[PDB]
Design a protein around this ligand. Structure first.
Ligand SMILES: [Zn+2]
Ligand SMILES: [Zn+2]
Lengths: 398, 97, 712
């Protein structure tokens, strides 16, 4: 009589699975179908039936679950590929030893690339642990950006966007993993924590996807500070750019370093930058010529004089040899200093805190002076005093 | 009456006024610190070919949202690649509609 | 929505070194609309509204100077011609008489005449020029002239026939009565050009003066002279103002050489035409409505007169936008209105809005209205049979899209070659970019935040979109462009229509062109049987089943929806429901012995006679379950008794179908064919014992004379 809800409730009361299935399909209430697949004992043709229904409905998670319960795995891979559910496809292929998925994703990414959808290809590579190719694509996008007006804030936006997408994908995967774990998973997580205590700088550097974002932000901050006086902060920022030298090419970094060093009268850094600039990889004869002409004029007007400053005691190690304020290299000790995104000054004090989105060390005095309500890099909109208290608690835990 | 007030209170700048603060900086900055370079026999005009105008570079603490940054970046890469408008012109929508 | 030019007449007789020019100042329009008038330097032109030609030759020499204004008398019987010769003539008019137009009464002021106006009720003339204003009454034939301090520019009489309004280039606007006394005076700082009176309306029943000042503003004034405070601003200086009949629209012209349309509140709707010169006078065609007449009245007609000497005619046609999901039909009424109609009780529900609606989409117990830069959503109380609409949420964000749809907790907008997904809050969520323009989209059911949809492009490729996938799934490819698509109830087949009115049916399991049809306007799938297709051409609607010849109806209209034993036909903008008989399909299914599908078809609300028929064949062909269902659907006792007798006797005895066929036949009043059936194979004795019970023994003896008793 085309009254599906009453028929469904009668079938549920009478323990009739097929009629319940058609009734739930007609009412389009697949929650009852999820309850059914949880209730259907094992290995029936009805499993294939609800798997096909789920695949038609577009919920390939339930379709794959039904196919795996049925005993067929290739149909689950077919559903995952047809609906472009690539995370589940990669997990199933890794668990079931499927080898064609990598190549298939390769030509699908190539097809997207030929359709001029590089960001979609980057998203696809993010979905399948291929972040290196996505990073290369984003670097190419930034290089294309430099060819035009090239507002650096847009490049900062795109790099922070890539980092946040990677962090989001990782956190969904982790939240899926921890929920409902066993003793073996607990032991694996304990070993992971033990390795996390004794980490290495290189591994953390590779893991962090904020390299381009922080590099571009430091470039923008250096330029902005240099325009509005504050030369000494500009030198520290330019030194940070020279400490990255990965996304930004040598020319811009050394140009900014030379400008800042000339404006602050610190001529050792200016001489180093000018020696760097004479031959990066290739240069025309006339450009090189005007470069040494500028160098000779600058260094023949008056000899390079080192501007005295304060040699604050080192906090990285127990050595009594003080290190210059601008220097972050920390020679003969190997203890490099973490940056401060707020102003660029190296962390030389106990007061340092970070948020749980970008984990960059913040100096309390700089934030108080600038009255920054948000994180300088990722713009996290939560009260900073509470972050300071939380970091103090975390340090007390350590 | 309430609509206008609430919109003005929130006013999320979507496209039109994201960073529209364009004022000549090639001549404004040469007032700030260029004179010391000029009285002396120093030529660094090549070396300032790297810096960009700062009046375009907007400096103020705002709120960054995941989705609206995503939309801005997609719209930027789209008009960079310039593929939407060419196929729109090849679509001859005005001829049909 | 669409604006189409009708006929243009140009007057190029420019005369240098002469004060007579080729400009046109005013265009008087008749109440009926069968005739039109225009004024040119030293001439008056008469035109037909429908076709552009001079019914009468241009009159020259009557007035030795230019003609400033021409107006009818709201009855199509008089003209008033004011000239710079300091004189005003009034002419009598009638189409049937041999002299169509002839001067009747001429009078003269002291200076040049600038404006004229008529009385809707008493047909009195008010003519105002420099230094003077005069009133003429037909009965007395005595004019009343009065002096004033500066030249009046425009005049307008109220629709009640009581009040009069005039304006001066010095900024003074005066409102007087029929006795010409200073009822109200308002002083401004800018010249006054255009005024009008709002038409009387049963909803409003109050008349106000609408005056367009030259400081880029439009003002509403009451009778006492107190402003209503609107003071709506404009980008361009207005020149002419005209109200449509019943006070629904407002035609505004002036600077920027554009003729625009507005609502009476002030909402912009469309721009009629851009001539590339100042439009001196634009007029609307009044309409006459019969007592209880039914008509969409979408057509609108405008007449424009420009500075260079072009008198052009434009026609405005309003498109139809509507939505139909289930048990409801929400269609756009006269602009800025939404009417929801139910097909059962024919009851209507009206929603009134001020701005123009662009798209109407209705989901489950939810309706979405797309106002200009505004979005409204209304829910429904399901428990009550009558619906109650309450505004749950409102969206202020401005969105432009030719197609808008609402799904559970999401909105979809199609703009150019892009599809945008909007949250109910307003912020954009996801984007999809396609090669060509997205022509038609169809939404299919599913879970919240997981509703799929179908998309057709101008190229023709049919794609599928999921909300969270963010990756289009190529369904199929079509060479011609796509106009409308439909999905089967089970999602087994898909019907697609091209630009040539060609219908093609594609199977989803195997991509093949199973069915092709020519000259198809619309099509629809059934929502209960999954197999019936009802497609309507321009004049004839055909219903087709699986491997069955089409059914013709010659019904006037287009098919929009198909439900169980129901087809929806829409004519113009009204809708109707028509029932269909399933007897033909039932018979054809009985022909090939697929009793299951025949019973499924008969379950769609068929008459009890077909039910007993199908039960009879089900019992005959040894199908007891379907026979029991058919004999149970209609209250029958003897047939079901014979049924359990047959099912009990089937397992043991030979189960000869002749006896049961004869018993079925004899259960009705027709007996002779049952006798013949029992006589056919061999059942004479059982026929005799069967026919004895009803006590007419003579014919039983007639039967037993031939029948034998092979026992011993
Ligand atoms: Zn040290
Ligand atoms: Zn941060």
């Amino acid at each position: 009589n085309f009254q599906w809800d009453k028929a469904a409730k009668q079938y549920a009361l009478a323990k009739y699975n097929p009629g319940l299935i058609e009734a739930y399909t007609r009412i389009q209430d697949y929650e009852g179908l999820e309850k059914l697949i949880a209730e259907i004992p094992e290995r029936n043709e009805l499993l294939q039936d609800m798997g096909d229904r789920f695949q038609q409905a577009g919920l390939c998670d339930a379709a794959v679950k039904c196919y795996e319960k049925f005993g067929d795995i290739k149909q689950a891979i077919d559903c995952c590929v047809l609906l472009n559910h690539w995370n589940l496809a990669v997990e199933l292929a890794e668990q079931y030893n499927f080898v064609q998925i990598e190549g298939l994703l390769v030509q699908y990414a190539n097809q997207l690339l030929e359709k001029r959808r590089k960001l979609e290809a980057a998203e696809l590579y993010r979905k399948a642990k291929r972040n290196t190719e996505a990073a290369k694509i984003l670097s190419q996008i930034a290089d294309d950006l430099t060819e035009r007006d090239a507002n650096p804030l847009n490049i900062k936006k795109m790099y922070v966007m890539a980092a946040l997408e990677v962090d989001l994908y990782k956190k969904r995967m982790l939240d899926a993993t921890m929920t409902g774990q066993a003793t073996s998973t607990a032991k694996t997580l304990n070993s992971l924590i033990t390795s996390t205590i004794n980490t290495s700088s290189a591994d953390k550097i590779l893991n962090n996807p904020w390299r381009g974002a922080e590099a571009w932000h430091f470039f923008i901050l250096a330029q902005r500070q240099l325009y509005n006086g504050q030369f000494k902060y500009a030198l520290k920022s330019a030194l940070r750019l020279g400490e990255y030298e990965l996304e930004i090419d040598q020319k811009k970094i050394y140009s900014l370093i030379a400008i800042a060093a000339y404006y602050n009268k610190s001529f050792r850094e200016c001489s180093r930058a000018f020696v760097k600039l004479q031959n990066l990889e290739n240069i025309t004869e006339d450009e090189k010529e005007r470069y040494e002409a500028i160098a000779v004029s600058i260094f023949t007007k008056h000899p390079p004089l080192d501007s005295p400053c304060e040699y604050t005691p080192c906090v990285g190690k127990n050595c009594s040899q003080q290190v210059s304020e601008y220097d972050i290299h920390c020679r003969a000790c190997g203890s490099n200093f973490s940056p401060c995104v707020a102003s660029g000054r190296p962390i030389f004090q106990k007061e340092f805190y970070q948020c749980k989105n970008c984990r960059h060390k913040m100096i309390e005095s700089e934030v108080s002076r600038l009255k920054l309500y948000n994180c300088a890099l990722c713009h996290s909109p939560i009260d900073f005093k509470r972050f300071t208290e939380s970091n103090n608690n975390n340090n007390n835990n350590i | 009456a309430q609509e206008q007030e609430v919109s003005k209170v929130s006013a999320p700048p979507n496209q039109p006024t994201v960073q529209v603060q364009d004022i000549n900086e090639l001549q404004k900055f040469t007032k700030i610190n260029t004179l010391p370079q000029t009285e002396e026999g120093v030529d660094l005009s090549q070396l300032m070919q790297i810096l960009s105008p700062v009046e375009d570079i907007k400096e103020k603490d705002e709120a960054w949202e995941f989705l609206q940054l995503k939309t801005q970046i997609y719209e930027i890469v789209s008009n960079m690649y310039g593929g939407n408008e060419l196929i729109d012109d090849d679509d001859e929508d005005d001829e049909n509609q | 929505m669409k604006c189409s030019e009708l006929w243009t007449e140009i007057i190029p007789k420019n005369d240098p070194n002469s004060n007579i020019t080729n400009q046109v100042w005013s265009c008087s329009f008749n109440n009926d609309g069968s005739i039109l008038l225009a004024c040119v330097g030293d001439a008056i032109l008469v035109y037909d509204s429908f076709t552009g030609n001079l019914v009468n030759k241009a009159i020259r020499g009557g007035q030795k100077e230019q003609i400033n204004c021409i107006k009818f008398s709201k009855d199509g019987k008089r003209f008033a011609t004011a000239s710079n010769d300091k004189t005003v003539w009034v002419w009598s008019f009638d189409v049937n008489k041999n002299p169509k137009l002839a001067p009747e009464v001429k009078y003269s002021h002291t200076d040049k005449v600038l404006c004229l106006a008529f009385n809707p009720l008493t047909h009195q003339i008010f003519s105002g020029g420099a230094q003077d204003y005069a009133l003429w009454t037909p009965d007395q034939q005595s004019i009343e002239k009065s002096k004033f301090k500066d030249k009046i520019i425009t005049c307008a009489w109220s629709w009640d026939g009581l009040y009069l309004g005039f304006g001066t280039m010095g900024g003074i606007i005066g409102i007087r009565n029929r006795a010409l006394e200073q009822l109200a005076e308002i002083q401004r700082s800018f010249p006054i050009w255009c005024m009008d009176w709002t038409p009387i309306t049963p909803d409003y029943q109050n008349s106000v003066l609408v005056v367009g000042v030259w400081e880029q503003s439009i003002a509403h004034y009451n009778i006492q002279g107190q402003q209503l405070g609107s003071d709506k601003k404009l980008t361009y200086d207005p020149i002419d103002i005209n109200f449509s009949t019943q006070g629904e629209f407002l035609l505004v012209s002036g600077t920027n050489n554009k003729c625009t349309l507005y609502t009476r509140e002030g909402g912009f709707l469309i721009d009629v035409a851009t001539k590339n010169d100042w439009v001196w006078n634009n007029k609307l065609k009044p309409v006459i409505k019969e007592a209880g007449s039914v008509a969409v009245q979408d057509q609108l007609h405008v007449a424009l007169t420009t500075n260079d000497g072009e008198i052009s005619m434009f026609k405005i046609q309003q498109l139809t936008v509507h939505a139909l999901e289930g048990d409801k039909y929400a269609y756009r009424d006269n602009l800025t209105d939404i009417v929801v109609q139910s097909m059962s009780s024919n009851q209507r529900i009206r929603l009134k809005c001020k701005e123009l609606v662009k798209n109407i989409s209705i989901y489950k117990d939810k309706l979405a209205a797309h106002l200009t830069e505004r979005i409204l959503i209304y829910g429904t109380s399901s428990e009550d049979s009558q619906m109650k609409y309450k505004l749950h949420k409102r969206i202020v964000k401005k969105v432009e899209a030719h197609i808008l749809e609402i799904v559970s907790n999401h909105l979809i907008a199609c703009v150019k070659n892009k599809v945008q997904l909007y949250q109910l809050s307003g912020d954009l969520e996801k984007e999809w970019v396609f090669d060509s323009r997205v022509n038609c989209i169809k939404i299919i059911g599913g879970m919240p935040n997981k509703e799929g949809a179908y998309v057709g492009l101008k190229n023709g490729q049919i794609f599928k979109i999921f909300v969270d996938n963010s990756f289009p799934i190529p369904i199929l490819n079509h060479n011609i462009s796509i106009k409308n698509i439909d999905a089967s109830q089970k999602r087994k087949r898909l019907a697609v229509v091209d630009k040539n009115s060609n219908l093609t049916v594609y199977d989803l399991s195997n991509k093949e062109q199973v069915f092709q049809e020519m000259n198809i306007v619309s099509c629809a799938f059934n929502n209960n049987f999954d197999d019936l297709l009802a497609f309507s051409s321009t004049d004839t609607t055909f219903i087709r089943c699986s491997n069955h010849p089409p059914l013709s109806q010659k019904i006037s209209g287009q098919v929009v929806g198909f439900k169980a034993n129901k087809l929806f036909v829409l004519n113009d903008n009204v809708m109707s429901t028509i029932d269909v008989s399933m007897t033909q399909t039932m018979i054809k299914y009985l022909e090939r012995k697929e009793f299951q599908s025949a019973y499924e078809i008969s379950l769609l609300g068929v008459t009890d006679q077909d039910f007993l028929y199908l039960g009879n064949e089900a019992l005959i062909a040894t199908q007891f379950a379907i026979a029991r269902k058919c004999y149970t659907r209609i209250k029958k006792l003897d047939f079901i008794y014979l049924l359990e007798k047959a099912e009990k006797d089937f397992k043991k005895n030979t189960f000869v179908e002749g006896f049961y066929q004869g018993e079925i036949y004899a259960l009705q009043t027709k007996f002779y064919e049952a006798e013949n059936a029992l006589t056919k194979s061999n059942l004479a004795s059982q026929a005799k014992e069967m026919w004895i019970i009803l006590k007419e023994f003579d014919k039983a003896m007639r039967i037993t004379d031939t029948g034998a008793s092979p026992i011993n």
